[PDB]
Structure 1
Amino acid sequence: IHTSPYSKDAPLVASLSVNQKITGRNSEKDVRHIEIDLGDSGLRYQPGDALGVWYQNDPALVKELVELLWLKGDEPVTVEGKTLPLNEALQWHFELTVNTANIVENYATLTRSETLLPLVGDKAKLQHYAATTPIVDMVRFSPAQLDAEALINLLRPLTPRLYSIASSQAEVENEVHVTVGVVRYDVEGRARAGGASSFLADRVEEEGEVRVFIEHNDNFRLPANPETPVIMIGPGTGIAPFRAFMQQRAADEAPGKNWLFFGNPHFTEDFLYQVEWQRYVKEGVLTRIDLAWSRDQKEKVYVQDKLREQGAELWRWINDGAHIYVCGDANRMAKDVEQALLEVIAEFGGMDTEAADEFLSELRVERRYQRDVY
């Protein structure tokens, strides 16, 4: 517009306007619709961008870790040029909620943990213990006396988390919306949680401050040409940019057809933004939707199962020049959705495994196959 001085290390201090649970009362998962006010900042983004969000660790987790280590919490510590009491350094500048094989290995080694040492250099044992046991539970289970400097030396610096933007400024203005699945789990009877998602969910009331920046994604964007059809595949929190896409196309009043593929365990508990979609379908901006409810029956159903069953109509849309978008879990979802997409291109459209491979690839270079997976 004519400048913007906010970025990762110089974030905009914004205001948390809305923090709403969007999953049902008996969902297995807690998902928050969050709206942050951008005020007169002039911060701008496009559908497909992500919002960078700084967080602080739970003060109660910090107190727990420090007392396990025989520390007081005060104790001056130096972090990137600044002398801080232990407690403030841990709350604001160190990751506490992501364990790693190296941390596990250095703690074990540092404290000479009789119970952790057999894992040392044992490779995948280390990675498995770290995926399984948070750092505070690692020292709960094998506590030891540490000095404040030895601790902070073990730890990795705190970094912001990315959330796909769930709004379009064409519709919203002054605001950015995000779709936050909050990471909650227990460890041998203790409640644990992800750092940033529980910070947003639990530790900022309303209109309280959040430190925010835009991570642009120019490789995840609506077609120019409002007449072009778009197919959106976004189970779970992967739905978020597709809420941004529909706000945009509804706002621009794009006549182009829209197809959404969504999946999650339970219709009843986990149909994120479902009134919004039903309205889109009724106002005719959303042309089609296919739902995959994992745990709604005996057999597990996923989006990729709907993509195959919807094969011939999908193919019809591709040849009409559709753009295809995938967002959500990369670890398993993105791969199985890609193979369903190769199966469909072969099945309908003049098969040959190798040629379908080639086709999916020309699509990506043409910008007609785009993904944002994590």
Structure 2
Amino acid sequence: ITIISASQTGNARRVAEALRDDLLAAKLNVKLVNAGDYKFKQIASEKLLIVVTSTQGEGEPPEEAVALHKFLFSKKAPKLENTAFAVFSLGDSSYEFFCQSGKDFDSKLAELGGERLLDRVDADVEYQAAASEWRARVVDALKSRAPVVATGAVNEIHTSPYSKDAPLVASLSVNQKITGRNSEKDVRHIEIDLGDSGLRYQPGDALGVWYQNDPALVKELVELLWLKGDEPVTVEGKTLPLNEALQWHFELTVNTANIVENYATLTRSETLLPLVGDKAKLQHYAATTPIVDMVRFSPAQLDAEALINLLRPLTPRLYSIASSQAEVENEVHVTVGVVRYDVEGRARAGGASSFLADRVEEEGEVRVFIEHNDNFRLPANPETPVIMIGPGTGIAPFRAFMQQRAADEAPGKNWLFFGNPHFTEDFLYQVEWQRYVKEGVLTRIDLAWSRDQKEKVYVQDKLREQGAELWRWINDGAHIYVCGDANRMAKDVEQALLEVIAEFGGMDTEAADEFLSELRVERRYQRDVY
């Protein structure tokens, strides 16, 4: 933000100073320069340019602004592309040309391509009236609602005031374990109350969930480094106790090759030095050793700033939305697989998933936003058939699909392929599926239980078993959806779809692949895999 003051007896400067003190209290973009010193030749690169000028000699500018005026009214003045500006004008009404100077600058700057931030404002002798409120909306219009440099806070969600950087403060209503006692996995059905926010979402969207690290994990980490936890550290320019920085502001539950390498170097660890510069060794160590355990295994003294400088900022996690608002109204449901594992007998857990499962009380606060996915959507035609492939937690959006199609009483046929280790332990939402089958909403359902018999069975095996009927549905205009594990499931499922298409469509592998690519183009093959 560049405030140019053009003044003869200092009134315009008093205003422009009154504006340097406002912006100074708001944004970090404020610099006050006199017109007589302003290097106008480089003006095009002004991101935010506010002019405060009085008027002299029948509309003549103040003396100090005369060169700047001639250079803007000159045949050689620069066109402006990324310049936002405003103009406040001072003068005396009794004169023929009231506020010529301020008028000139306002007209000419926009005529060079400058983005008019506010409408120009004039004022007579008694100017602390018009000036006191102009200075007001400028600070607002020059806040995040029209930024350039300092503080932006820009996000994207339908027409909402809520976004990833300004999330909704919601509350946790339901937190329920939906895998059986003998499951190898902890899966939670989560209902979050949206209150009166008006936050909206469609099936296929995901929920962005901010979280905090486990205070126990922060404490274990802080101790192993021989810190106590109240050491001050700088986080985004402000000063926090270490514990608060670690709990709220940095990733602790994900290790990376870079972190291993940096930590090896900082500590000269004999265990870790040998991995330095070997990307595959570093990645493998990160993947098997959480940060807190890397520290255990390679003790070293680090001060608080050295630790926090090691870490990446904390980021929210996404969770496919498992409800339809037509059915649940001012709520959002998710299906959370809690990452739980052990390192030499010490319990470890993913940050967000264990935050929701273990560290938020009923009615407890949860900060959320919507991640819109326009490329994962039910057909617009309520009669088009729908094929859904979502084993594990990939089941979530298909709960939302069926809540929606049932709410709309869509007559389209629906087909679910689901899979997990055990029928008696891992049939997520079994009793709802039975109800959908009973009610005629869920037309077909095929299940793959990978650990209920000797040989492994997965959804791709049921896709192959169902080849003939799948191809029939595909020729009836069916949309195919795949949600869940990217690394293995989505690939094996795509391979099985290609085999079905090749076989029952009578084409070779390259033709099947082009056919599936045509379904993508047609938005009839959509995936949300992660």
**How far 1:2 sits from its partner (Å)?**
9.8
Q: Hey, what does 2:432 align to over in structure 1?
A: 276
After superposition, the C-alpha distances for 1:54-82 in whole angstroms (9 at most, x for unaligned) are 00000000001011011110010010122
Q: Hey, what does 1:7 align to over in structure 2?
A: 163
Aligned with 1:219: secondary structure? coil
CA–CA distance in structure 2, aligned partners of residues 11 and 262 of structure 1 = 33
Aligned with 2:375: secondary structure? coil
**How far 1:122 sits from its partner (Å)?**
1.6
CA–CA distance in structure 2, aligned partners of residues 63 and 360 of structure 1 = 51
Aligned with 1:298: secondary structure? coil
Does residue 317 in structure 1 map to residue 473 in structure 2?
Answer: yes
CA–CA distance in structure 2, aligned partners of residues 71 and 147 of structure 1 = 7
CA–CA distance in structure 2, aligned partners of residues 152 and 2 of structure 1 = 35
CA–CA distance in structure 1, aligned partners of residues 352 and 159 of structure 2 = 28
Q: Hey, what does 2:357 align to over in structure 1?
A: 201
Aligned with 2:431: secondary structure? helix
CA–CA distance in structure 2, aligned partners of residues 260 and 313 of structure 1 = 13
Gapped runs of 5+ residues in structure 2? Answer: 1-156
Q: Hey, what does 1:183 align to over in structure 2?
A: 339
**How far 1:219 sits from its partner (Å)?**
0.3
CA–CA distance in structure 1, aligned partners of residues 510 and 492 of structure 2 = 18
CA–CA distance in structure 2, aligned partners of residues 370 and 200 of structure 1 = 28
- Structure 1's consecutive aligned runs of 4 or more residues displaced over 3 angstroms after TM superposition are none
Q: Hey, what does 1:85 align to over in structure 2?
A: 241
Aligned with 2:326: secondary structure? coil
CA–CA distance in structure 1, aligned partners of residues 508 and 159 of structure 2 = 51
CA–CA distance in structure 2, aligned partners of residues 302 and 100 of structure 1 = 31
Based on CA coordinates, which of the two structures has the bigger radius of gyration?
Answer: 2
Aligned with 1:171: secondary structure? helix
Aligned with 2:294: secondary structure? helix
**How far 1:355 sits from its partner (Å)?**
1.3
**How far 1:187 sits from its partner (Å)?**
0.2
After superposition, the C-alpha distances for 1:263-298 in whole angstroms (9 at most, x for unaligned) are 100001000000000100010100000000010100
**How far 1:354 sits from its partner (Å)?**
1.6
| Number of equivalent positions | 374
**How far 1:3 sits from its partner (Å)?**
4.3
- Identity %, equivalent residues: 100
**How far 1:205 sits from its partner (Å)?**
1.2
Aligned with 1:297: secondary structure? coil
Residue among 178, 184, 188 paired with 1:32: 188
**How far 1:137 sits from its partner (Å)?**
0.4
CA–CA distance in structure 1, aligned partners of residues 370 and 398 of structure 2 = 17
CA–CA distance in structure 2, aligned partners of residues 145 and 353 of structure 1 = 58
CA–CA distance in structure 2, aligned partners of residues 3 and 9 of structure 1 = 15
CA–CA distance in structure 1, aligned partners of residues 324 and 461 of structure 2 = 30
After superposition, the C-alpha distances for 1:68-122 in whole angstroms (9 at most, x for unaligned) are 0111100100101221000000000000000000000000100110111111112
Cα distance, 1:2–1:80 mapped onto 2, change above 3 Å: closer
CA–CA distance in structure 1, aligned partners of residues 273 and 500 of structure 2 = 50
Mean CA deviation greater in 117-126 or 213-222: 117-126
After superposition, the C-alpha distances for 1:101-156 in whole angstroms (9 at most, x for unaligned) are 00000001001101111111122111001000000000011111000000000001
Higher relative contact order (CA 8 A, sep 6+): 1
Does residue 107 in structure 1 map to residue 263 in structure 2?
Answer: yes
CA–CA distance in structure 2, aligned partners of residues 9 and 255 of structure 1 = 40
TM-score normalized by the length of structure 2: 0.70
Does residue 150 in structure 1 map to residue 306 in structure 2?
Answer: yes
CA–CA distance in structure 1, aligned partners of residues 278 and 196 of structure 2 = 54
After superposition, the C-alpha distances for 1:224-254 in whole angstroms (9 at most, x for unaligned) are 0100000000000000000000000000000
**How far 1:173 sits from its partner (Å)?**
0.3
CA–CA distance in structure 2, aligned partners of residues 105 and 3 of structure 1 = 44
Aligned with 2:325: secondary structure? coil
Aligned with 1:348: secondary structure? helix
Aligned with 1:16: secondary structure? strand
After superposition, the C-alpha distances for 1:153-175 in whole angstroms (9 at most, x for unaligned) are 00010000000000000111000
After superposition, the C-alpha distances for 1:321-355 in whole angstroms (9 at most, x for unaligned) are 00000000000111110010000001101222221
TM-score normalized by the length of structure 1: 0.99
CA–CA distance in structure 2, aligned partners of residues 246 and 282 of structure 1 = 13
Q: Hey, what does 1:16 align to over in structure 2?
A: 172
Aligned with 2:245: secondary structure? helix
Aligned with 2:523: secondary structure? coil
